[PDB]
Amino acid sequence: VASRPYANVDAKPAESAAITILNKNAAPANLFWADGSVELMYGKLAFPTGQG
Amino acid sequence: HMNIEEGLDLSSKTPTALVQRLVPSVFKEPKNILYTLDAREMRDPEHKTEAG
């Protein structure tokens, strides 16, 4: 019941429900997004100054 | 240090040999501590500070 506000699909799978693969052939992807989901974190390693 | 000798005429007596004894004083092999930090670990300065 606590999961119901977080639901994302209209029903649970049937018993032995079939799977359809969309990528029938190998192909290059064209990419789409709405902003704020796709991100780069940037960090700096501590390479010391003065030592060596 | 000296021998004692007895009597007035000492012509029969060996005089005391002066022995210049010496005491050695020497350094040990130097004593060391080694640690390492990688360039990820060095991002937190407490590691160097507490290990020092």
| A50 part of contact set with chain B, CB < 8 Å | no
User: DSSP readout, B3-51?
Assistant: ----SS--TTSPPPPP--------PPSPP-------TTGGGSTHHHHHH
Distances (CA, A) of B37 to A30, A45, A50, B16: 43, 12, 16, 66
* Segment (H or E) for B51: helix B46-51
Q: Which residues contact B13 (CB under 8 A, 6 or more apart)?
A: B5
Q: Give, in order, the Cα–Cα distances in Å from A45 to each of B35, B37, B40, B49.
A: 19, 12, 6, 18
Output DSSP code: residue B29.
S
**Does A1 contact B at CB distance below 8 Å?**
no
Q: How far is A36 from chain B (nearest CA, A)?
A: 28
Q: How far apart are CA A33 and CA B52, in angstroms?
A: 49
- Tokens representing A51 are 């030592």
| Interfacial residues of B (vs A; Cβ cutoff 8 Å) | 39-43
DSSP chain A: -TTGGG--SSSPPPTT-----S-SS--PPP----TTSS----------SS--
Are B50 and B35 a contacting pair, CB within 8 Å?
no
